[PDB]
Amino acid sequence: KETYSSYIYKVLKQTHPDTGISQKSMSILNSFVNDIFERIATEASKLAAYNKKSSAREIQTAVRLILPGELAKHAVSEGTRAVTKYSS
Amino acid sequence: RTKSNESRQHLRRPLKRPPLLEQIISGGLRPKLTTLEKSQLDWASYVDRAG
Amino acid sequence: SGRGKGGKGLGKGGAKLRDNIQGITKPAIRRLARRGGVKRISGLIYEEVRAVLKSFLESVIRDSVTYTEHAKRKTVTSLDVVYALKRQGRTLYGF
């Protein structure tokens, strides 16, 4: 078993260095992250079945209609900045 | 191996354990009475004697 | 000893409500109503709320039991309820 508590903990720590967490909230965040991941991933799968064929454009477009546009543009922009950082 | 046999015991057996007196009364309260069966004995005797 | 009769033979060994009724109560429904923000209520609500439980709880119960049977698990776990909640359109977080 590999939990995801460490990553959310360090994200909270880099956005709030003196705010604690509760155990129920840990499961809340874990389930939120998991089900959002699954939802967007099956959306990407159906978008791959969308095109008459067997990348990152599919996931960008999938996040582009699943969640409200205001946060969607920030999501795609920061994802692109992340892949540019990871490119080299 | 060529000893003088074993003549020291004289068949010692002091109690340990009495056959029935130990079970019925040693000491009081019918050891491990669990009164249900003591009541069984009492009720059976009473009903037999009273007919 | 042999002659006569008496009780000294121990025994051979023989053998020697599951209907259940619905719960809930009027004060509980009143507290739930006060949570929902109602100033005054009539005297016919409680029967209808009980009907809502009798129409909502049992359906998800059947779906949950058929799911855990489909999982070949001869027990019910809290995680099984989450599948039913997801397919019912009302998902719950935390379990």
Side-chain angles (χ1 to χ4, degrees), chain C residues 51-54 56-58 60-63 65-69 71-77 80-87 89 91-93:
Chain C
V52 200
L53 299 322
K54 289 323 185 300
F56 183 80
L57 190 37
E58 88 299 347
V60 306
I61 272 296
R62 314 201 271 211
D63 168 45
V65 287
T66 187
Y67 195 91
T68 172
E69 175 43 50
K72 317 303 151 207
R73 184 51 280 151
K74 338 301 173 177
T75 325
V76 152
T77 46
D80 184 286
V81 152
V82 201
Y83 304 92
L85 300 214
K86 283 253 201 203
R87 44 181 70 151
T91 300
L92 152 75
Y93 282 134

Side-chain angles (χ1 to χ4, degrees), chain A residues 8-23 25-32 34:
Chain A
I8 51 183
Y9 203 178
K10 52 188 53 74
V11 162
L12 162 53
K13 205 43 52 193
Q14 54 84 51
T15 198
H16 261 155
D18 49 41
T19 280
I21 210 76
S22 95
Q23 195 73 338
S25 57
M26 152 292 305
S27 168
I28 290 297
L29 271 293
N30 216 303
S31 184
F32 180 125
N34 294 327

Side-chain angles (χ1 to χ4, degrees), chain C residues 24-28 30-35:
Chain C
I24 323 294
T25 181
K26 177 212 169 143
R30 155 84 66 80
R31 300 196 307 260
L32 210 69
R34 286 262 165 274
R35 173 87 81 71

Side-chain angles (χ1 to χ4, degrees), chain B residues 4 12 16 21 23-24 28 34 40 48 50:
Chain B
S4 83
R12 44 105 167 204
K16 317 281 286 310
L21 206 52
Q23 193 44 290
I24 186 60
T34 85
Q40 277 176 39
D48 272 308

Side-chain angles (χ1 to χ4, degrees), chain A residues 6 8-23 25-32 34-36 38-46 48-52 54-59 61-63 65-74:
Chain A
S6 68
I8 51 183
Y9 203 178
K10 52 188 53 74
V11 162
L12 162 53
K13 205 43 52 193
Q14 54 84 51
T15 198
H16 261 155
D18 49 41
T19 280
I21 210 76
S22 95
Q23 195 73 338
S25 57
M26 152 292 305
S27 168
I28 290 297
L29 271 293
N30 216 303
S31 184
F32 180 125
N34 294 327
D35 81 346
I36 291 331
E38 311 325 325
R39 173 179 328 195
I40 194 49
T42 88
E43 203 44 83
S45 79
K46 309 320 288 175
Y50 203 60
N51 166 237
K52 324 251 174 83
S54 166
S55 173
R57 155 166 142 88
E58 311 76 338
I59 323 169
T61 43
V63 85
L65 60 175
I66 188 185
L67 84 90
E70 311 66 10
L71 328 173
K73 304 153 261 293
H74 306 106

